[PDB]
Symmetry: D3
């Protein structure tokens, strides 16, 4: 299958791209005026070892800037301009009006560098906590960048990690707050089920044995223990027991970026 197929042929994400362009050009593009529309050739370079990600997003930028691109690598590929036989690697060839190329450049690179960084960190962590023989899964969180959740979750997936719940409208996640708000884990879970129904899972964060057990009997689908049913521990950075899920914002939040660059022939 193809990850980019997760993105609907059309939807709000394409308008996100348009807005990112507008964010860069509130009025006029002075540089585009001085450079002109002569057709030009350009290479997109990857200048740091890491996994390529964000291809469909960068491509949408290129599409809206009316350029012709040819990717030399499939998304998800691990690149290693490690050699520095030049120190970098051409991952795409671009053609189009000079101004159009220089306009798409920074926005496109801002997407690739950040999406690749998340993917790279996600992959490092799962493969790492694979190599121990762990069979469970490593998941993300909701601690995403404001306005950039679709892109970052998508990058988690390409990295080989679980996204965990997309938002607050997806899997219900109950805590102590909700628990004694209704009287007991049972009530909290029953009221959650009363509105989410069968199509969506309910997860309850516990801290003891009994607590977990009443949640199970209440109908909870997941139980978070935190630092018929699945088990999850959250926070854990460097431990692997035989829990089903380990959640950590480490694969997506505050991660290093993968450097890219673009140059006209």
């Amino acid at each position: 299958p193809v990850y980019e197929h997760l993105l609907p042929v059309n939807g709000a994400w394409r308008q996100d791209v348009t807005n990112w362009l507008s964010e860069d050009v509130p009025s006029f593009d002075f540089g585009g005026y001085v450079v002109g529309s002569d057709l030009k050739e350009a290479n997109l370079y990857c200048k740091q070892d890491g996994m390529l990600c964000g291809v469909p997003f960068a491509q949408e930028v290129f599409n809206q800037c009316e350029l012709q691109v040819e990717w030399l690598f499939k998304e998800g590929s691990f690149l290693e301009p490690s050699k520095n036989d030049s120190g970098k690697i051409v991952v795409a060839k671009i053609t189009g009006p000079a101004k159009n190329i220089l306009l798409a450049e920074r926005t496109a690179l801002n997407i690739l560098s950040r999406s690749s960084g998340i993917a790279t960190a996600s992959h490092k962590i799962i493969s790492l906590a694979r190599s121990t023989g762990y069979k469970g899964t490593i998941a993300g969180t909701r601690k995403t960048t404001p306005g950039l959740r679709r892109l970052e979750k998508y990058s988690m997936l390409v990295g080989g990690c679980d996204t965990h719940r997309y938002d607050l409208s997806s899997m219900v996640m109950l805590k102590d707050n909700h628990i004694w708000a209704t009287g007991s884990i049972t009530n909290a879970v029953k009221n959650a089920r009363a509105v989410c129904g069968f199509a969506v899972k309910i997860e309850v964060e516990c801290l003891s044995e009994d607590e977990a057990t009443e949640a199970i009997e209440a109908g909870a689908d997941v139980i978070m223990l935190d630092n018929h049913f699945l088990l999850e521990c959250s926070g854990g950075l460097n431990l692997c027991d035989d829990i089903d899920i380990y959640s950590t914002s480490s694969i997506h939040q505050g991660t290093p970026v993968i450097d890219f660059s673009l140059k006209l022939a």
Copy 2:
């Protein structure tokens, strides 16, 4: 003066906040339904040493969620839950309907953690390259997070760094591409000036002495040398000559985040 005064009482940034809420709740807030509207008290905790930033943005989230907040620290303050007399520090007191608090929580914390992280890195770098006795300035770049430029530039400022140019509609930045596109640095600069006028500066990236010098005579306001007029070097991470500006995406891109948390009494 007050940094938050840079933000217009009303504009698109407030709609950005609304959209960040919508990004978290596409349909229903199941948890808000189970917890209810009973008034509750909550403390916002800073769990890592660093500079507080993003206050006006987090406050807008709280405002739209109809809550009452009292900040215990001015924005720009360096916090040091270093002590772990508890390991954390209450930076704000919040009151309002249970559901409203839990709805604002993740979005508000996603803003603070990232804005504080950028501020903290920005401050570390300038103060560092201060301590050497350098009198010039440290600036950022355009390698910002897509859709989050206002917030990140704002954080650079609070950190004590220069934002550098906001976008492509602000200071013109000419390169080799534009240069031989018109015939010479002089032409590129003349065509740029022809459209940007007197109100906006023109910066030309050079690589030699003469080049710099023709740019100066052409009317360039800044000259980038890269790895009446000002001088700037770009890339430099760990060197301080007596240049006027040192640009590096290090103070804002791929920076660690500062951990925060929120808990109901």
Copy 3:
């Protein structure tokens, strides 16, 4: 003429379609990922006797999903999968990437089923109150579905009914409230005329003879009697006098839908 020509080649209605897609895919299209982009063939089936409507809207969905469609029937056609020689009727042939077809499907069918239902009810009512020899017109109301007024009014037209006034900015409709608000029907009508001018008609709802008559002398273009000038009665469902207009939300509000389906070869 062609009804779909009422829709401007470009305007907000096309953005409505985009938003309907986003409403169905807030994050990822998991099914589109599992099915892939292989080209596929598909038939759009009409599974209930009724008039075909909403063609230009369904087509916009197909266009944005980048598919190739061929309609086998003109909009406004009465279909009668009455036969159940199969029980259904292929009204369109579609081709395109598997994922793209399944993405457009539900949204496209939600449009056709509802637009056809309105058209079908509208047609049934006018033709019915035709067959009596009535020469006047049957009109709709403003009791449309929130956010879907353009589509429903358009469907009323295809059905052979009058839309009546599109909104509150179109024909002025005065009631008792406005009447004694100024002192008399004459004043209400004079103040309405004072702002709407000659380009827009003024309608006054009366309940007696004199009332109607003062409205006529005041300059009213239409007089509603309700359960140089035209006459209208509103509410009436099952009566036909020689009034000019009979208004009823029955041709568009709370009407049955016409079932459609889509299947890949």
Copy 4:
């Protein structure tokens, strides 16, 4: 608990309300000009037996129109202006500028009538298929009105029915198309799981015994048979076996509306 708490204090749904107002007043409100701003009193009447629904939405309309409202009944209440001791029932008291009341009126009533209709049909069906002693659940579909999904799903809930899956980004629903697209139910389910992860359920539509059984072994959470795991039958209108879920668009699509009205004192 309170159903309206499912709605986030702020999000896109409130902007939906604003747009519904704009849809009614593209330019000027001639009637509002003739009536004026004098404070007025108004009663909201329910003129048909059915369940009250859409309260938070109608209230948002009233809020944006700056009016004061007092609801005489809790949402979810079954009303029976059956008596026609007057034939109707005051469900809310409104106060505010004349023009503001008449502006909110049609939009507010268009919401109540349709939301109550859906709720009423939903309730009739579950209670009905309750009375047989059926312990399973009755669910809706994705055949919602374009642009009005949040409101209609919300109404399904108030009616006492399950919403079923909200959209295509929520529970994965695999069919034959996806099945042989990968080679087997097992593959389809494995690829779906590969992208949706543990937080979201996977449902597979089958037509035989074995098929169901391979889906179960593949990891499917639900199995649709259509006309550890749950079972669902879809289409069924008037049959109740001991399946877990019965899906039908009947509780929300093409349902009669509940008539309301508003009158100034």
Copy 5:
């Protein structure tokens, strides 16, 4: 009555105001930062003889900038800082944070100056072509400023002129193009009526006697002769016969502006 009552308490026009603010502050308001939030007093001055218009729009700007304003003159008032006992006239008193006042200033004044200019020209023309004893009406056109139609039409009204048709969805206006497109004025008018219905008027532009007459018999509501039924001539700037309407873009297009200013105490 009050003209500002034509504007719905809430709708897109208020979002237009927000966007006008964003158009002025894409990133930061440097001046607002240097001036601060200290409360200040300010007078809004009218520096040129003309009619005051655009009050509700300027007020919305002030409202969104959270200021307190007191208008010293009703909208529609003719001002004559003719005296230059100072040369200007305080039309409003404003109070609020320094930064908030200076932010609203230019946008608010850009609205008043242009709306007053249109009103002033509109009034000059009708009063002028009043003074001749003409009893007909002077109307505008569709040659409005892109994106500013609501404001300019509204200003035409305050000036004492007819707006003429608001847009292409309001009164149908047929020309030769449409006429021979169907075969004859009769056909064009019949097809127009077939879609616009009774609620909207149809206007046909003629150039001869017979032409006018067939339009009348076809059902046209207005007949334009251009350089039961009404008559209109379009273009005419400096002629008054006993036609009903004289259309000219002169009252709104390319009109001088009325100068205003704002100063802090």
Copy 6:
């Protein structure tokens, strides 16, 4: 170079065009329905002496209306249908469906007439104050039409004038208000510099010699005297000293329009 290259291949300005179309067709295009889609030919005529401007904007309208256009003159060309060998001049040839041409017409002409008017006035003023031998520049202001700033600034440029500062986020412009708000011009300028940095110029309005001089020493880039550093006088309409900049809203605000028309063959 080409002025239209200042506009980004894609951004908000293209959405502005879409909205201008929606502003003209809130519901249906009755005329487009009566005229049909038959291909037609059309000439765009310039009926008044002046400079052609707004070409890229009018072209976007034509593009969205799916038409084929051929401009007979480069933007910036001075036209002189002075001859009235016919009285007008074909500046563009258009082809496409009848309805599509008539839909784009008014919006396209509203853009050309106003953009050309601004350009024409801008050119008249600079060339005029050229002919005196003045070597400085003539600039505009921020007194632009709400929502139409990009278009009007762009027109100023084509006219041969300086735009002056685009908005409040571009060059800082300090006044007395800001000056004594901090204690002195020096403080105001220092606080402005503290937030705008090196990339953006600071302008201070003075009224005396010393004042100018302290601003210069404070670091101001421009000094406005009003009715290393540059000098500017603002207001001046009919005086030319050897100042660097003369600002006047006369080249863009309240300027006459250049009449255009469109006719089908």
